[PDB]
Each structure stands twice: as structure tokens, then as C-alpha cells.
Design a protein around this ligand. Structure first.
Ligand SMILES: CCC(=O)Nc1ccc(N(Cc2ccsc2)C(=O)Cn2nnc3ccccc32)cc1
Ligand SMILES: CCC(=O)Nc1ccc(N(Cc2ccsc2)C(=O)Cn2nnc3ccccc32)cc1
Lengths: 304, 304
């Protein structure tokens, strides 16, 4: 028992982190097979960051201008190309530590682990969720760009995020591993504000089921609701509207606990309307939304 | 910017996890050099768990009775011994993935990362603190025993915890890597209740400094206090008494923010007396105590 914000073991990703330097800018790269993936803003100087023309900037760059170091050894760059907001540096050596991997573009509300890196070296790992406004509430400092987000299915690593920027609001924006930004963000040092950050309702319900499985039951009530009634309350509290797809994914949790999804929604409704009244759920005084129903099942069963 | 409950990269520990089986019981082992460390209750059956005589139980066991598997390959056991509550299985092969390592016994209030494992395979990593009552609020299921807690200083892994049991209260108890339990716990399935869990005051203050560094300043007030006045309030709220040693370790955080330690204590005092009033600090509606001053400095500077 016990419930924790758990990240995937980072080992398979640690073996992929390299340092990429272009001129005087150093950031992280992801070495998979014979390709190193990194944010394209590695080619930028502080002046050409206000409004950079990456195609024009990359013209003045050659393979020898990109320094790729894996631990203490230098990789030889034999090709370079830009795919959306990422640079792909072809190296002459395949990474011997390349795990089985995939590049996936995650949906908002889905969770992933981030291996924060500096100078190609890992500093820490934590669990994140892609917010409905397509930002992540991470922990990144200057030099962390190129750090990646990922999920792991037994031996396969699904890379889903590459860190590119911090918005003036302290939230983080980045791309998938094809260089496409999540959300409307551009790799330009300009006014970019995030949209309304809504709560991921299906994840809060999954976390309420995790609380029941782990002994925290005070919030269970004698009531039920309907999807339409619940959604009127979810709208009022800037919670994502709950759909039948969401009810369906909560099915295994509903079956494990014997608490119908709509009954759990009525518990959530009362918690939204009345608050926690100074109480806690799974050691938290707020409703946690960064655990998906899959995460709750995984942690509560022991998938390695 | 941003503040997260970050764990150390688990890679160096993943390469040490093995599966240990004795009869019909399987748990995790830690392979370092030519020794495999695991909880001694691996030799127990469900009957000899109510009151086990481990010396008598281990007499009926030979080197060949301990099955050690590293991934898909079997290790040959050439020696076995009991050191306090751990078994040390000498194997004929040194772990090629053995990192630079130390065995340390941590102090209550100190933090560490746990790599939760099942059948010698890692499932996840999370950050923990050794509670003042010597328990950890982890996330462990049956089969997780032998999972380890650790800290990392650049390339050196300091192992500090090995998981042994879950108390009836859902909290976790375990040993250091010499087999000595943290706290008064015994490896026996008996009534063992934890003492009062107090809040780690120095860690809450460190987390308030992290909130200031990251923009959350609403809680800063126009007041100050003394160590004796603050401690009268800390006693009332079952917070650990703050000492000059604690003030000293908060020095670098106090210097970074320019907020005197006693002024921050007065902010904490008002937060304890008045509560959060529906507000949050670093995305939390309660006072977080599982970040030490070292953790805050590390995360807010980027130590890899
Ligand atoms: C020498 C060249 C140079 O100064 N480059 C540079 C690169 C990226 C950034 N930006 C903004 C931006 C502008 C275009 S693309 C991204 C970040 O947000 C980088 N970043 N990412 N996470 C951060 C966390 C803290 C501080 C900075 C952070 C700032 C400067
Ligand atoms: C076949 C032999 C057998 O049944 N062994 C066994 C081993 C350990 C436990 N105990 C209690 C205990 C008694 C003596 S030493 C520890 C746990 O708390 C194991 N444990 N650790 N974390 C857990 C989390 C969930 C369930 C059980 C957990 C229970 C059973």
C-alpha cells in the first residue's frame, strides 16, 4: 500500500543523453541509433532569439560546428537536418545503449516521466502531465533544454517530449520527438501566455479510486449523479468535461473497488462544492490530477 | 524555475537489482561486487513469520537453496551469511555494472530516492524522507521487499535503505545496508505501531525558501520571531524543534533570498496558526516537509 508520484526507472534514458554545443550554446541531446535529437534553438545567439530565422541561421552551420559529446567521448557528426523545431545530427556511431524505442505524440491529460539533464548529464527524474493547455509544470533551469519526457512499456521507451522553453509564467513548453510543439508555442523569446489550465477530471477520479484502494475513504458519500449533472459542476470549477470514454477507462478501477464511476463523480462533486474541510487524501490537501487511470492500475498492481 | 519532488536518476541502481528466491519466496536483491544483499525474511514461510528464529531457519539452508537471477541469467552462490536483518549471498561473479558506492545510515528527516522493484525488475522511482518516527511513507506491494533507498553524489551511490515490511498502518519499515532496522521495528509479523509522526521543520523552511526562489511569495509577512518563540508554536503543531544547527544549514537559502531564517520562521508560524486560507505554495495546499535544504539548493542550481 501507499501512493506516490512515481516516475519510470530512468536508466534506459540516461544511456541516451549527450551534450550538444553549437558555438557558445550548450544543451542536451538524445542519442538513439546514429542520430542525435536536440532543440533547434541550439544554433541561436541571444540576439537572434527575439525573432530567429532558423533556416537562415542553419545555412551558416556545418556538421563540424555541432559538437556532440557522450560522457567524455566526442561523436563525429556526418549529417545535420532540421525537422520542425528539432535538429537531427547524424553521427558515425550508433548508440550502443539505444533501448527499444518509439516516438509518440501524447494527448493532453496523459502523464510521463522527465529526466532533467544539464551538459548531457542527468540531474533527476520526476513525473509530469501534459496540461490541457499543452504546457508542463516541470522543474527546469537554463541548460535543461533537450531534456526528454517518456513512458516505458516493459523494455520499450516511448519518447513523447523534448524540453524547449520556459514561458514568462514559469510553466514549460516543448515538442514531441518530431519537433512539433505541444500547443501554440513557438521557439521564439516573445510574449506567449498559456491558455486556461483546466483540471484533468478523469485523472482526479482515478486518484480518488487509488485513495479508496489505499484506505482513504472519508470522502465517499451516499450520493450519485449523472454525466450531465456532474459536468455542470466540472464546468463551474474549470474541470475538463467527463465523457463516456473517460467512464470506460475508469472501468477497471470501478470494478476493483466496487464503486460505480457516477458514484465516485458524486464524491468529487461534493469535494468540489464543499472542499476538503482541512482533511487530506493520499497525503494531499488538494485534488491531484497528474495520475491517469493507467498509472493507478500500474502502481496498484506492480507492473515492471 | 518550477519545483518538483525529484528523484535521483535510477540507472546506477537498476544495474544492481537481482531476484532472490528461497524455496517458494521471491524478493529483490542488491548485487554489488560479488555480494547480493537481501532481506533475511526471504528464508521464511508464512508460518515461521509470526515468531521466526532466523538463526535456526538459516541452519536448514545451503548456498544452493538461494536462487539469484540477474535479468535472465543465474548467479552461482558460493557463500551465505546473516548480518543483522540482511542476508549476504556471496556469488562467484562481480557485478560488471557495480557503480562507485557506499553504505550509509541516514538521519531521520533526510531524504532519498526509492527504486521500487518486483522480481528483480524496476517498476518505478520516487523521492522519500525517513520520518522522525523512522518509517517511510512509500509505495510498496507484496514482492517489493529488497527494493533500496539511495542518494547519489555525482558518480557515487550511497545506499541508505532496504525495504523489509509494511506496518498495519500502511507505512513502511526497513533497514540500512548493514541490516539494522531504522527505528524499533523487528522483522516479525506482529503488532508494531509507529510513534508520533512529527513534521520536519527544517525541511518545511527549506521548501518555503524554494517557493520564494520560484515566485510564490504570498506567505511572506512583516514579522519575525525567536528560536524559543517559534519552538513553542512548533511543539503545539507537532513540528520538530528547530535548533541553531538547522538555522546554520538554512544559511545558503537565507543568503540567496535575503530573508533571515527567523523571519521565514515567523512566516511558518503564521501559516501554522492561520492555515493556507484556500491558497497554495508550489502547487501544494499543505506544508511540504520531504525536501531538505540540500535538496532545495541542488534542484535550484542543477547539480548532476
Ligand atoms: C546563447 C543563446 C541563448 O541565450 N539561448 C536561449 C535559449 C532558450 C531560452 N529560453 C527561451 C527561448 C527563446 C527561444 S527558444 C526558447 C528558454 O526558456 C530556455 N529555458 N528552458 N527552460 C528554462 C528554465 C529556466 C531558464 C531558461 C529556460 C533562452 C535563451
Ligand atoms: C511465504 C513467506 C511470506 O509470506 N513472507 C512475507 C514476507 C514479508 C511480509 N511482510 C510482513 C513481515 C513479516 C516478517 S518480515 C515482514 C510485509 O510487510 C512485506 N511487505 N512489504 N511491503 C509490503 C507492501 C504490501 C504488502 C506486503 C508488504 C509478509 C509475508
Amino acid at each position: 500500500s501507499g501512493f506516490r508520484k512515481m516516475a519510470f526507472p530512468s536508466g534506459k534514458v540516461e544511456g541516451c543523453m549527450v551534450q550538444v554545443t553549437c558555438g557558445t550554446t550548450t544543451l542536451n541531446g538524445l542519442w538513439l541509433d546514429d542520430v542525435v535529437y536536440c532543440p533547434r534553438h541550439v544554433i541561436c545567439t541571444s540576439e537572434d532569439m527575439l525573432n530567429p530565422n532558423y533556416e537562415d541561421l542553419l545555412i551558416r552551420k556545418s556538421n563540424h560546428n555541432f559538437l556532440v559529446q557522450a560522457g567524455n567521448v566526442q561523436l563525429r557528426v556526418i549529417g545535420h537536418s532540421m525537422q520542425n523545431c528539432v535538429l537531427k545530427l547524424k553521427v558515425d556511431t550508433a548508440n550502443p545503449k539505444t533501448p527499444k524505442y518509439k516516438f509518440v505524440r501524447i494527448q493532453p491529460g496523459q502523464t510521463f516521466s522527465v529526466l532533467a539533464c544539464y551538459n548531457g548529464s542527468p540531474s533527476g527524474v520526476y513525473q509530469c502531465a501534459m496540461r490541457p493547455n499543452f504546457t508542463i509544470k516541470g522543474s527546469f533551469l537554463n541548460g535543461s533544454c533537450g531534456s526528454v519526457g517518456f513512458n516505458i512499456d516493459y523494455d520499450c521507451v516511448s519518447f513523447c517530449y523534448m524540453h524547449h522553453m520556459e514561458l514568462p509564467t514559469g510553466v514549460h513548453a516543448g515538442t514531441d520527438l518530431e519537433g512539433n510543439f505541444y500547443g501554440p508555442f513557438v521557439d521564439r523569446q516573445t510574449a506567449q501566455a498559456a491558455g486556461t489550465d483546466t483540471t484533468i477530471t478523469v485523472n482526479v477520479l482515478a486518484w480518488l479510486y487509488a485513495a479508496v484502494i489505499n484506505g482513504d475513504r472519508w470522502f465517499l458519500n451516499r450520493f450519485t449523479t449523472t454525466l450531465n449533472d456532474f459536468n455542470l459542476v466540472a464546468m463551474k470549477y474549470n474541470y475538463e468535461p467527463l465523457t463516456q470514454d473517460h467512464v470506460d477507462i475508469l472501468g477497471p478501477l470501478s470494478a476493483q473497488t466496487g464503486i460505480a464511476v457516477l458514484d465516485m463523480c458524486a464524491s468529487l462533486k461534493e469535494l468540489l462544492q464543499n472542499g476538503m474541510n482541512g482533511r487530506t487524501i493520499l497525503g494531499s490537501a488538494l485534488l491531484e490530477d497528474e495520475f491517469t487511470p493507467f498509472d493507478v492500475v500500474r502502481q496498484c498492481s506492480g507492473v515492471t
